[PDB]
C-alpha cells in the first residue's frame, strides 16, 4: 500500500504569493501523480496529471515538477481563487490520496477575545452540565485552551470546534464544550478555561464559581 | 458539460445494506470507466472502487473488499455500488467519478468527480435537540461587546439549521461546525457578538430547525 | 533482447478502462448466427395494430 | 390475479402417452409465452419445454426432445403437453409458468408458476395396502413413555391418508413420507408416543384411507 | 448445459439472522439469474431477477448480489415467512436450476428418543419382515443408523425416511426400515439397530431376539 | 437426428444458371444460420456462404460475391443458392451445413454437414464412351498371371460404371478415377488380372453403362 | 486472407499407432479452430470445436491441443474406423480449410508388377493411340513412370490415374495413359514405360514395337 | 463496386441547421461501421464524426460535439448527419467514408470515399456578378502576344461559368479559382492570351453563367 | 414503466430566437421517441415521431434529434404560434409522457398592482370568511404571497390561482383566497397580504383591520 | 479468502493423456498468472509452467517442454494443464497456484497454492493386495510387551487403509508408508505393540481395506 505524505499540512499565504507544495510517495511512482483542488463543500476538480500537465481550462499560474518519490506543485501568482485545499494522488498502484494541504489567508496577528459561559439551569435540571468557553476572532488558528476544576486539569472530557476562515475578515472562532454529569458539576467549586495564543504576552484565564 | 449526480445516500444502522447511484449526462457514460471514492474526516480521501467501462474488471479497496459491490446500467446510464455489512467507519461522503481519457498505455485516473453524498453509519435514532441558551453576563463582557449563543446539543442525525430572530439578525453570527460525541448525538454551538448597550431590552431568540424529526424550537436568551 | 520470464504477469489496475474509440466498427461475421431461445417470447404491446393493408 | 389451473395428471404405464392442460386466468393469456418446468426428488428443478406466445417457436430439454411436444390454444386461453413414449424417471410434478414482461432485448424466464400436476410412470398395478401394528411392549418403553404405530406397506398407487381414532388423535402423531419399494409398491409408518400408564385401557386404531381403490382399514394396535 | 451448484445446501438460522446464500454455475452467465423461493407442498414463488432486481411485492429485507458466475441472495433480517427452500437460476443459455438450499430453523441441541419394533406375526405369514427403528424429537439432523443382524451389518436392504421440522418444536423424526424374506428372517436371532448423534456421548444400541 | 438433402446439381454451360435446395429435417430449421460449403480436387474445401437464421444478414466468400445469392423458406424448411454466371472453377461438391449451438459471444461454424450435390460446369455436350480393349498378350503375363482390361475414354458427363462378365468377375478388378481431359471428356481405365491359363479360352466382355446417354457397351477383349 | 497449412500431407501409420498432425495459420486465430474428418465418398463429420474440446459422441481417444497460430490433433490409439482424412478449420475471420491430412494404412514394402497394352486397333481407326502403363499392388504410393518413345523422353502428353487403397490388402493401382495423334504414333518404333520405385533396386522398362 | 453518394449539401446561413445524407450500395451498408470526414482550404482534411455499424456507439470530434449528430438508417443503407449551430468555419467538402474490414483486434480507419458535397456557411445573400472588362492595350502587349480577360466581381454563392465567344475559343485561357474576399463576396478573373495582330478585327466577347441567379452576361473586351 | 423527464420545465423566449428543450428517459427507448404539441384549452397536435421524422404539415423550423436516453427538439425560428405547451412520449414500452414543457412568451419587467379584500358582510353571515388579495400585471411569474394576521404567519389555509398569459400584453394575475370559520376571523383584528417579487427591491404590503 | 481445487488427476499408462483443472474461487481470477507446479518424492519441488492473466505468455520447465500445454478459461475460471506423453518421471502431486500481487518492475512467484492433485504414471494393472500375517512369538518379545502386525503386500494403486479391530484399536499402531517395488507394486506394513500377557486370549484382526478394487480383507494374527 503505496503511502502518500503532504508536505506541509496548513500554508498561511498572500495573495500575490509565491506558493510550493510537496507531495512524497512511500515507494517510486515514475510520473503517475495527480493534484486535485477541494473548496470547501464542494467536490474536488483535476488540476494536473502526469506529475506536470495542465488540466485544460486550468490558468496558466499553475505548474507541477518532480519525478520518482518527489513532487512539487508551484502557483506562481496566489489569487483569491486559488484558497483552497490541495490533494496530490498517485495512481501508479491502485489509489492513495495524500492528507491534504489547505491554503490559507495570511493576515497579520489578532488576539482572541474569551468569553466563557455557564450552564444553564434547565440543561442542569435535564441531568448534564455543559460549560463552554469561547475564543472569538483570532488568528493564527493555533491556540491552547485547558480546562480547570479546582486547579485541576481536565482530560478527556472536553471538545473543540473551530470554523473556518471569515469571508470578511479571514479570522477564526474556537468553543470548547466541557460536558459533566450534574453529580461531577456539584461535586466541585471552581471552573475554569485557559487560553493561550501566540498573540497573547499573557495567558488568559476566566473562571465562576458553582452557584455563584 | 459533464455532470454527475449521485442519490441513494441517508442513515443506516450498521450491518445493514444501502445502494447509492449515480447519474451521469453530457457525455457518452458507456464509453467510460467510473470510480467511487469517499472522503472523512478521520481518514481523508480513500478510494473504494473502480469499473470497467463494460463492467468486465473490477477493483475494490481492501477495506471493503468482500462487502461492496460495484455495477453499472449503461442503457440507463447510471452506476450503481451496493454496500453491505456496513460498519461505523464508512460514514463519509461518497463521489462518482469519471476517468479521464488518455493515451492506451497510460495509467489512469478521475478528472471530474460527481456532487456527492453523505453516508451515515449509526445506530443513533432519529431525535430532536436540546436547545439551551448561553446567557450573557459581566464575565462575559468586555467594553460594549457581549457574546450569547444557543447550545443545539443531542440530536441525529446531521444537519440542523440555526437562525438569530427569524433572520435578522446575521452580522456577527458564528455557527460552529457540529461535532460527533461518544454517544452517538450530535452537537453543536451558535454564538453572535451584540452591543451591551442593548441588553435587557432587546430579545434574541435563536430558532433550530431539524427537518429530519421535524423539529422546530425558537429559545430565547436572557441576560443575567 | 528477450522477455523477462518472471516479469508481472497479472492485469494492471490503472489500465485504460475507458473504451477504444478505434476499435473495431464492423459487425462480426462469425458471430452467433441463430436465434435466442431466452429472447422475447411475449407479444409486443408497441406492434403493429392495424392492417396490412 | 393471475391464476394457473393444471388438470391431466394420474396413472400412467410406460410406453403410453397423456396430454398436460393448464388454463391461464386473469391476464391474457395470447400476450405471453409459456413454459413447462417439472420437479423430482432425484434432479430437482428441471425446464422441460417453452412455447411462444403466437407458437412460432418451442424449445426443450435434450433429455425429453422427440417424445415431448408442447402447445397452445389461444382462443380457449388452454396450453398443452403431449408426452409420448413416457419413461419411468419422467415421475415428477409438472408446473406450467408465465413468462415475465420485460424489455425487447433482455433474456426471460418464469415470474409465475401453477399449482403443478403429479405424474407417476410406474408398470405396478394398483393395490390396497397391508397395515400392520407396530405393537408397544416393555421392549419399546422407557419411562413413562411408551411408542406405537402402524405400517402401511405394499399399495400403489400413492396417496394414502391415514388417521387416529377417526382424526380425534392428532398431538404427537409422525407420519412419515411414503418410499417407493423396488416392487413399485409404495410403503410408509406412522407413530405416536404416548403414556405407558395408559396402555391396556386408551383404545388405539389407525384408519387407513385410499380413495382410488376406496380402500379403508381400522386396525387397532395393541400392546404386547 | 450450464450446471448450478449452490451452497451450502442447508443452513440452520433463527429469526432475525442475516442470510446469505451462493450460487455458481459452469460458465458466464452474464447477469441474467433468478431466484425463487419455494415452500413445502406450494409452487416456487419468484423473488428476483436480473441478479439484483427486487420483484415487484417482494419485501426490502431480501437482496440479491454477483455477477459472471458467483451469485449471492442475501436476506438482512430472517422472519418466520422467510422459512422455505431458495433455488437460483441461470436463464442466460436455455434454464437450469441449482438444487436447492432449505433453511432451516435453528434450536438447541435435543437428544433422540430411541425405539424399536420388531416384524408382526401377521406378515410373518405374508412373507415378508420389516423391522422398523425410530428416533423421536431429535436435531440436528444428522444421525447414523447401522442394522446388525446377528452382530452382522446390513447393507442394500433397508430404506430410511425422515420428516420434516416439527412446526410446534422444530425436531426431526426418522424411520428406518430393515425389509428381509421369511426365511432371511428366521434364520436369524438378534436383531438391533445402532445409532450415533452428535448429541450422543456413547452410540446407542436397541435390540431384540426373533421370538422372544 | 439431424438430416439435411441436397438437390438440383447437375450439368450447366458456362454463363448459365443454377439454383441448388437443402431440405432440412430432424431439428428446428428456423432457428439455426446454414452454410453452403463446396469441396473441389483443386482447392480442398472452401467456404462459399453463410446466412443468418431469419435471413437478415449474409455473407460471400471473395470468389462468388456478386454472383452467388443464398436465400431461405422457413416455412419450407429449405434452403436456397441461386448461382448465376458460373466459371469453370466453380464446378465442385456443394454441401449445406448447419451452424452449431453455442455461447452467445462466441465464434461459430457448422457441425453437420449434408449429404452434397455435384456441379459439373462445362461447355461439352452429352457423348457417349468410346470402349477401347486393352488386350492381353506374352507381355502382359508374369507367372500364371495375365492383365487385361477396357479403357473408356471421351464421354461426358459422369459417371459410367464398368462391370465384367455382367458381375460375374470381381477378383482383381481395378476401375480407376475418371480424369479430365484437355478436350473436357473424361477417361478412365479398368483392368482385371486373371489366370493366365484361361486366356484363349475363357471369354471375358466388360459392361460399360452410361445412364445420361443410356448407353451399354458390352466390349470382348481378345488378345492379339 | 488467413491461410491455413496442414502437416504432414500423407502421414503412414498402423493400427494402434499414437497419430499427431499439426496445422498452422498464417495469422493468430486465438483458438478458434476445429477439426473435421472426412471418409472417402461421405460427408465430413465434425470432430473438435475450440481446438480442444470434444464433440458430443466422440470417442476419447481424439484430442486436440493448440493456441495462437499452432495447433495439433492426436490420435492416442489408432483404430480401423479412424483411417480418414482430417481438416482443419479456423473460424476467426470467416471461414478457409486446410488442405487436408489422409491418414494412409502403413504396409511392408511390395514392388509393383507391370503390365503394358498397346492401343487397339478401333481407336487407330478412330485417329487417336492411347498407350496404357499399368502398375498393380504396390506400395508405398510414390513411384515415377515416364514414357519413352523411341528412347525420347515424352512430357506434357500423359495423364495419370490412381485408385484408393484397396480394402484387402491395402495396395494401390495406378494406370499411366500416353495420348498421341495416329501420325505421330505410326511415326515410331518402340514404345516404353520405365517404372521406379523404392521396392526395386533398378528401374523396370516394358516396351512393345508398333505393329509387332 | 462500392459506390457512396453525398446529398444535401448547399448554401446555409449561421445558426441554422441542415442535414447531409449518404447513400451507400455495392456492399451491405449495415455490416460496416461509417465516418464523416470534411476537407477545407483552411484546415485540410478533418474527422468530424464516426458510427458504429449498429449505433451502439458514435464519436465526435472535439470542435463539433455537443452540435453534430451522427445516425444511419440500415434498412435504407443511408448515413446521416444532423448540424446544428453551423458556424463561418464549418464551410468545408463533407465525405462520408467506410471503414475497412479487418481483424478483431486492429486499430480502424477508412478505405473508401464517397464523391463529396460541398456546405457553404455564410450569411451573405444570393447576388448575380458584376462583369467589368480587363481591356488589352500596349501596355498589355510584349512582341505579338496580348493578354485581355474579364473581372466577375462580387457574386454569391459557388460557382460561376466562363466560356469565351460561346466556346468557340478555348486554347490559352486561363479562370483563376474564385478567392474570398472581406465582404463574404467571391470575385475570381479570366484572362485569355491573343495575338496581337487580331486586335480590333477579332471579337472576344466573355459568357459568364450563373446558374443559382440565373445570370447570364455577354462582355465584349474592346481595345484602348 | 419507463419514466420521462423534460426540461426545462418553463421556458421564456421571444419570437425568432432559438429554441432548445431536452428530454430524458429513465432506460434505453432506442428512436422510439414522438413530440407533441399542445396549446391551452386545446387538443395535444403530433409535430414528430421516431425522434427526427416530421409529420406532413409541421413546417419545417421543427426538428428532433437524439437516441438511446436524451432526446432534444428544436425550432430553429420562434414565431408567435409557436407558444404552447410541448410533450415528449416514448412508445418502445407501452405509451408514456413528459410533464411537459411550456414555451413563456418573454417581455419585460413589471411590477404587480396590489390590492385587498377583506369578506364581505353576507358571507360571515353565512359562516364563512375569505380574504382575497390580488396581484395584477405582473411578470415574471414568480411571485410570493404570504397572509400575515396580526402578524403571524399563515399556512395551510389558503389556495392560489393564476391566469395564462394574457393575449394583448403577456401579463399575468394572481388571486390569494384565505379561508377562515367565521369565529376564527373574528378572533383577530388585523388582516394583511404581504408581496415579494423580483421587481419589487422591498415587500408590498397591504392590511385591514376587522370591522373597518 | 482465496481458494483453489485441483482435480483431474489418476492413474495412466506410459504414453497417455492426462487433463488437469484447477478451479479458482475467491478472487479475480482473470486479473493473475498462475503456475503449476509438482513434487515428487525424487526431485522434491519443481516447476512445470506459467501463463500469463490473458494467456498471451505461457513458459515452460526444460523437462516438460513440447509435451504439456497449459491453457485458461477466464469465463470458467478454471486453469488447464495438458500432459501428453507422459512418461514414468512425471508421477507426482501437482499445484496450481496463484502469483502474487507486486509492483511493475519486480519479479512474480506464487503465493496461494492449491490443494493438489495425484498423478500415478505406471503400467501396473489394478489389483487388489496380498495380506500376510506378522505373528509374535518368543523371537519377537523383549519383557511384557510383544509385536505382531500385517504385511500389505503387492497391491496397485494407492492407497490403502489398516485398521485394528474395526478401529477400536489405536494406541500403538505404526503404519509405516507404501514404497514402490521393482515389479511397480506398492507394499507396506501394519504393527501394533501389545501386551505379552494377552497373547493367545486376546482376537486380533486387521482390516485392509483397498477401494480401487473393492478390497476388503480382515486377517487374524494368531501367534505361533
Not at chain 1, 495570511?106 to 463552554?132: H, M
Not at chain 2, 454551538?189 to 425558537?218: A, M
Request: net charge neutral.
Amino acid at each position: 500500500d503505496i503511502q502518500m505524505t503532504q508536505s506541509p499540512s496548513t500554508l498561511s499565504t498572500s495573495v500575490g504569493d509565491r506558493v510550493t507544495i510537496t507531495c512524497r510517495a512511500s515507494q517510486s511512482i515514475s510520473n503517475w501523480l495527480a493534484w486535485y483542488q477541494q473548496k470547501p463543500g464542494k467536490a474536488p476538480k483535476l488540476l494536473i496529471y502526469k506529475a506536470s500537465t495542465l488540466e485544460s481550462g486550468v490558468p496558466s499560474r499553475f505548474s507541477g515538477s518532480g519525478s520518482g518519490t518527489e513532487f512539487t506543485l508551484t502557483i506562481s501568482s496566489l489569487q483569491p481563487d486559488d484558497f483552497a485545499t490541495y490533494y496530490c494522488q498517485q495512481y501508479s498502484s491502485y489509489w492513495t490520496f495524500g492528507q491534504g494541504t489547505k491554503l490559507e489567508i495570511k493576515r497579520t496577528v489578532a488576539a482572541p477575545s474569551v468569553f466563557i459561559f455557564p450552564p444553564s439551569d434547565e440543561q442542569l435540571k435535564s441531568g448534564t452540565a455543559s460549560v463552554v468557553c469561547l475564543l472569538n476572532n483570532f488568528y493564527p488558528r493555533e491556540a491552547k485552551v485547558q480546562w480547570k476544576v479546582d486547579n485541576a486539569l481536565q482530560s478527556g472530557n472536553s471538545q473543540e470546534s473551530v470554523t473556518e476562515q471569515d469571508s470578511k475578515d479571514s479570522t477564526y472562532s474556537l468553543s470548547s464544550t466541557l460536558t459533566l454529569s450534574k453529580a461531577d458539576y456539584e461535586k466541585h467549586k471552581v471552573y475554569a478555561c485557559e487560553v493561550t495564543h501566540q498573540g497573547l504576552s499573557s495567558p488568559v484565564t476566566k473562571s465562576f464559581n458553582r452557584g455563584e | 458539460q459533464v455532470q454527475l449526480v449521485e442519490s441513494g445516500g441517508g442513515v443506516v444502522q450498521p450491518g445493514r445494506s444501502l445502494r447509492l447511484s449515480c447519474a451521469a449526462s453530457g457525455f457518452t457514460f458507456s464509453n467510460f470507466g467510473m470510480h467511487w471514492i469517499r472522503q472523512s474526516p478521520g481518514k481523508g480521501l480513500e478510494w473504494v472502487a473502480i469499473i470497467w467501462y463494460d463492467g468486465s474488471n473490477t477493483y475494490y479497496a481492501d477495506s471493503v473488499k468482500g462487502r461492496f459491490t460495484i455495477s453499472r446500467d449503461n442503457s440507463k446510464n447510471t452506476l450503481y455500488l451496493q454496500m453491505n455489512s456496513l460498519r461505523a467507519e464508512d460514514t463519509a461522503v461518497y463521489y462518482c467519478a469519471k476517468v479521464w481519457f488518455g493515451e492506451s498505455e497510460d495509467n489512469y485516473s478521475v478528472d471530474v468527480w460527481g456532487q456527492g453524498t453523505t453516508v451515515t453509519v449509526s445506530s443513533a435514532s432519529t431525535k430532536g435537540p436540546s436547545v439551551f441558551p448561553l446567557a450573557p453576563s459581566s464575565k462575559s463582557t468586555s467594553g460594549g461587546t457581549a457574546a450569547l449563543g444557543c447550545l443545539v446539543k443531542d440530536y441525529f442525525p446531521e444537519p440542523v439549521t440555526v437562525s438569530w430572530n427569524s433572520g435578522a439578525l446575521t452580522s456577527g453570527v458564528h455557527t460552529f461546525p457540529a461535532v460527533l460525541q461518544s454517544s452517538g448525538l450530535y452537537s453543536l454551538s451558535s454564538v453572535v457578538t451584540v452591543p451591551s448597550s442593548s441588553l435587557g431590552t432587546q430579545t434574541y431568540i435563536c430558532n433550530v430547525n431539524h427537518k429530519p424529526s421535524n423539529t422546530k424550537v425558537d429559545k430565547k436568551v436572557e441576560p443575567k | 533482447p528477450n522477455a523477462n520470464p518472471n516479469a508481472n504477469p497479472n492485469a494492471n489496475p490503472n489500465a485504460n478502462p475507458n473504451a477504444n474509440p478505434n476499435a473495431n466498427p464492423n459487425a462480426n461475421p462469425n458471430a452467433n448466427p441463430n436465434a435466442n431461445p431466452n429472447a422475447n417470447p411475449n407479444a409486443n404491446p408497441n406492434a403493429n395494430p392495424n392492417a396490412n393493408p
